[PDB]
Design a binder for this molecule. Structure first.
Ligand SMILES: [Cu+]
Ligand SMILES: [Cu+]
Ligand SMILES: [Zn+2]
Ligand SMILES: [Zn+2]
Lengths: 153, 153
């Protein structure tokens, strides 16, 4: 492995198309991507525990990451194992993602392949809710659409 | 892991909800479940290598298996790896899947978690179609709908 993509879907217009590429195993994974079909503003963007989708973008789980610290993101140290957090969709629903992370592993041990990328309706609290949800998905609301990665190359 | 799924979809009516269970990491991966939404008769069913779905069930790799031999099936020895043969849909558009991939494993070395499942428009010739496509994907034709393997246990 070296390049990974997840295509997200659920609502229909909301089609996500992430690109997690590791230039090397010693390179941070640049977790870039291009969702379209959403409404404006920041949206829920995270990892979730299970890759599973049997219930329809739900069974996937809450953010039951092993290093259970606090729901945060690239804004926190406490971040779960792939809280991108809050990424902004244009008026067109076009959310460009271009962040890089030195925590996850495309392949290795963590093998962040059979995970469920979820696009949520709302922005997360990035932990600040001070609610049970706040330490889990923040306050992102439901999973609108979701996708499994599956490696690219 | 021990339990994984693959939710296939593309068209909308057509969706699979396949359950991959390996009792151990070295037991048979019994891949069971069903695709609902098909039309009657035999249909495309394989395990494509790349997760990649960026183009829409198109780019996922025309069976880029390691044991590059022939597109075959449980009819042939020379089968790529996850050439299921053919899944046959009832009149209701319900095709049962219930096979043991008594070959590969979800985790360990073979680690098929991540691979992409595709339901096709037409039946597989299983190599003996006599076209490049017979030997590549079984002449099974248009990849109506597809899904990516994700862990559930
Ligand atoms: Cu999420
Ligand atoms: Cu296929
Ligand atoms: Zn989180
Ligand atoms: Zn094949």
């Amino acid at each position: 492995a070296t390049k990974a993509v997840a295509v997200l879907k659920g609502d229909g217009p909301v089609q996500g198309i992430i690109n997690f590429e590791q230039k090397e195993s010693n390179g941070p994974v640049k977790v870039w991507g291009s969702i379209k079909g959403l409404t404006e503003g920041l949206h829920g963007f995270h990892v979730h525990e299970f890759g599973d989708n049997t219930a329809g973008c739900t069974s996937a789980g809450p953010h039951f990451n092993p290093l259970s610290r606090k729901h945060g993101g690239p804004k926190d140290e406490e971040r779960h194992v792939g809280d991108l957090g809050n990424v902004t969709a244009d008026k067109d629903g076009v959310a460009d993602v271009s962040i890089e992370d030195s925590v996850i592993s495309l392949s290795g041990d963590h093998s962040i392949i059979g995970r469920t990328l979820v696009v949520h309706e709302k922005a997360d609290d990035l932990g600040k809710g001070g609610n049970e949800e706040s330490t889990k998905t923040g306050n992102a609301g439901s999973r609108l659409a979701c996708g499994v990665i599956g490696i690219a190359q």
